[PDB]
Design a protein around this ligand. Structure first.
Ligand SMILES: *Cc1c(COP(=O)(O)O)cnc(C)c1O
Ligand SMILES: *Cc1c(COP(=O)(O)O)cnc(C)c1O
Ligand SMILES: *Cc1c(COP(=O)(O)O)cnc(C)c1O
Ligand SMILES: *Cc1c(COP(=O)(O)O)cnc(C)c1O
Lengths: 327, 329, 332, 330
């Protein structure tokens, strides 16, 4: 019962990448003067080493999964779309009716602080808000937790270039919008874990989940997009509106492709020219086989590669999307 | 956005009960010799005060809710159906594919240990197992984490409401998690739908809600099973619910009272025509439901059979049996 | 157990309408010398009086509801969007894998024939194709299709009466039943499987409303018994994409709305969106555009037919007379 | 787009059976003097030959599938469980809120009359009631519901040879069974959009038929038949989102007579994949072994012991006098 949700990064500041391709870590030396260097969390008023970051077991964020979150990443010392992330995070907490114990500006400053104190130039930055464990010592009960740890990869840097295989899950379906809405990024992964176990048993890396009506939704930690005859399709319902997805669609429109956020069928996936995954934890990933059949030509698709390359170049190009971190 | 899931017991060792009725706390002075008294947790090899019980934020039990659990209670210093609870707990972790980092016997001893150290004679005892946060410090052994805690007994509905009854709605804005998403058969921490249903109950002016499944059948509520009585038979859902151990006990009691029992599909129409409706959970026992969607259930007061089952339930806490295990304090 | 799916038009060539408003029947006298006048069907190669139109009980269109269809109407002697209707009909039969035993031009000609022979200037024209009852009489060498095409033209039918087209109706969101899922029997294919739509009508009746809107499995608003559901909010018209028929009245309403400068969005619609809407209206060939002025016992917007509903409805009925590619006069 | 729902019987009074096995047609000669012989229907008060049996196209039983039904069969001149069928029929029409325009006793007499006039000793006897096409010809007091009956030659979902040798099935992945809160499979009905889709999927995947899952992923039934499985001395069959079949009821009665336990309740695909035996049950053919599922053998991959015992006993009950059989008076 070994389970692989993330392929790389879990305790590795620098992961191996394809030489000469578009994904390259920063070349630097981490000053370890601070015990916060390498991973820093903010928990109940204090910045703490990641190895020491702990939460009350009585927080309903645990016992009821009464919690929502987002993950923004830092690459080459630049935050990517931090404000978009904190905006989505706040909208989700409102929908979940979890009161926010901090302002948008305070959350962004806490996130910048964890990164700065960690010294990490490539980072995974989780912020979550829970319903809390009751009255705080010392009036909102909601708890905000933040951490910046080394960048995490659902699929490894090598597979970002070379591609992955997938199945459409048959043993499990995605959480319905009227049960716990995937539109709200959340920690309830019972169906996503089941789907990953199914993919493993079927000899594939990961799975795409269908919803109650049989339409394609997302996978465990990533959105699913397809390209067919000049148009990029991706699900509207029963998925997170990913910000990597948002970026990929912006890039595709800049390339002159049309984009449709709307219902996607398995039959559409099986006739697609290309399929790729999208998530903050790794970026744009070609899906080159589906249910044991090649997607398109069976190699990373032409548009997927362009979109992926443009995505990584956007981590360095000055724009409204990139914010340098003050170390 | 204030949310009431539990009505009593949170940081409250002894709660108010109805004098002369079947629910009575122990009469004693809590021995506070040890800092564990009043609330004891077991976390990563150590017994610690409940107030200091913390888990790694990186446990997948948090970030993926990759966790299952059970809750057994202690009443009058007796564990109730401890072995049934650990057996169900183990079966659910197997189904969830979470490797168990201890034996049944070790789990039972950790639970007994937390209660004994807490000194509580009326206690809520949670054990859960998580996928974990990766390789355990110092240690390819298992990564799963077992956490235990014993805290003062918790009440979904207060002791006074266990006697006087509560009101409910059938939820219309949310459905119960399907068996083929995350099965309610496995007791779990994914309460997104159960919290939404509680908010809907509050908006509609009722205490709590019963959720329907995708096909429109009655399942359970936020932290409790739903049973109904009609013309000499007790009905309760089979699918898309936890097979509750309070439910199991109530059905055993009902049969000994001469009632028939059917675990099977339950419709809203069945509920609306019921003679009686009650809730069942370890966190409070057997609760009359006296109004549904603003209409009285039967005569609108706690029903004859509900009261008999409730009384027998609490009497079982004091009756030596294979269900009762005294805790050594 | 009495059930009202249609309010007017059954065995009534002329129904009462609101004087001065946009819905008016033709003024004429029907020549009844032909037994086909007043209602004509085409069944298995013969034009017959509608009252005598019967089909084999062994047709799988009955025993398995293995059938799809469309309804086009005639108003003031003009077919409205006949070609759009036959194209959707053909596309649905293909999806349902029912071989079509006639060409598009032949179907259009049979529908024109039924109307012409009925003499009706205001008509409801149903064409359906069934899987059939097996090998046709006289055979046609196993090679041949078993599918059956049935057509009829009868007096125009009203899901909601002409008066209610002006004054509006009330509705409920159904709670006892849900719409057929796309992965069971897709509402995208116009079909005769109305088990859920009948249940929803009964529920509306029990709750004291004229009709019901059904939700899908995920809780989104779909359509009602025989009509699409549209809403208006802050300059945008919304209507469901999934688990509904892509109605041609809906199509026309959205075209009119964009001509009026409104935005249009075919996509997921929630009950919360409906409860906040400025306006709600129904759309179907059997009646046109109907204001919905109360939902679940609460007024919709200001509680009277909305400004945009009325403008769209008025333009819709005007399009029955305005020369265009949407209307084709019937040769009587 | 050729679709196979039934394998035999559609226009054949006598179909091929396996010599020596439990299924044998009567040996007789049908007098065809009467136009009713070989197939008789009752429509709006008239007994008519099957080939002339037609209904108004305006019946809502067509345009809205506002109709429920049952099928009882006749074998060796005996009706099998006729009264059980009419009681279930009546109960479904009540749930569907279709007023019944005839008594139970009248319904049974019409079915016996169609069979008698048909002359068929092995027959498929459908009775359905529809919402109707409006006021009947000839007061608005009166019911508009239409009762239609026909007796035609016995029909086979799976051929009599396959009844002995077994069939292969798939679990459908492209379609699900109609939910109880859409149109309840508990009411026998004509809405087969999902069942037809499931059949096309089976054909595409190279199996004879499919089993449909419900929304929650549990095993329901197939196109015109219930699904039962045997595991370690217990027969399992779905409770929800299926017709409570009368063949199923008989098979469970027999299983308990044989000492087996029976559970009507939720069935998962994992239960099917672990079963000793799987079989189908329907009035149109009886008890059929399912010997392969999703391309994998069921148990030993040949008709199972209990399946053959139940099927053999089923066919023998067509001849043994009992409360279940009622001879037709021809
Ligand atoms: C986070 C995640 C995604 C991707 O969202 P991003 O904003 O691009 O990181 C998609 N689906 C699920 C379930 C996720 O958890
Ligand atoms: C715990 C709980 C129950 C009750 O189960 P018990 O064994 O009686 O405590 C029922 N349903 C849910 C969702 C629960 O969390
Ligand atoms: C036909 C009908 C409609 C309306 O479609 P039109 O093309 O406008 O007539 C909508 N929904 C259902 C279920 C219908 O039967
Ligand atoms: C009729 C049929 C059955 C079998 O029912 P019987 O009473 O045994 O004939 C099972 N399922 C479906 C869908 C059917 O149509």
């Amino acid at each position: 019962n070994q389970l692989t949700i993330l392929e790389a990064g879990l305790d590795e500041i620098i992961c191996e990448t394809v030489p000469g391709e578009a994904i390259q870590y920063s070349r630097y030396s981490l000053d370890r003067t601070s015990p916060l260097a390498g991973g820093c969390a903010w928990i109940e008023g204090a910045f703490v080493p990641a190895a020491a970051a702990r939460i009350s077991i009585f927080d309903a964020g645990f016992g009821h999964s009464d919690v929502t979150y987002t993950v923004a990443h830092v690459w080459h010392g630049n935050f990517f779309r931090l404000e978009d992330h904190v905006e989505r995070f706040l909208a989700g907490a409102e929908k979940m009716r979890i009161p926010m114990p901090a302002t948008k500006a305070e959350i962004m400053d806490l996130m910048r602080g964890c990164v700065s104190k960690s010294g990490l130039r490539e980072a995974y930055v989780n912020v979550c808000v829970t319903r809390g464990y009751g009255r705080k010592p010392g009036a909102l009960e909601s708890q905000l937790y933040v951490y910046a740890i080394p960048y995490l990869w659902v699929f490894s840097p090598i597979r970002q270039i070379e591609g992955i295989d997938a199945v459409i899950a048959q043993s499990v379906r995605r959480s319905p919008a009227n049960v716990m809405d995937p539109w709200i990024k959340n920690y309830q992964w019972g169906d996503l874990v089941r789907a990953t176990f199914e993919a493993q048993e079927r000899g594939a890396r990961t799975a795409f989940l269908l919803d109650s009506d049989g339409f394609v939704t997302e996978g465990p930690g990533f959105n699913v997009l397809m390209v067919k005859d000049g148009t990029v399709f991706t699900a509207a319902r029963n998925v997170l509106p990913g910000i990597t997805r948002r970026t990929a669609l912006e890039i595709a429109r800049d390339f002159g492709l049309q984009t449709v956020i709307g219902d996607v069928t398995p039959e559409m996936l099986r006739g697609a020219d290309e399929i790729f995954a999208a998530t903050t934890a790794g970026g744009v990933t070609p899906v080159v086989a589906l249910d044991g059949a090649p997607v398109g030509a069976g190699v990373p698709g032409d548009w997927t590669r362009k979109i992926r390359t443009r995505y990584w170049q956007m981590m360095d190009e000055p724009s409204d999307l990139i914010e340098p971190v003050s170390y």
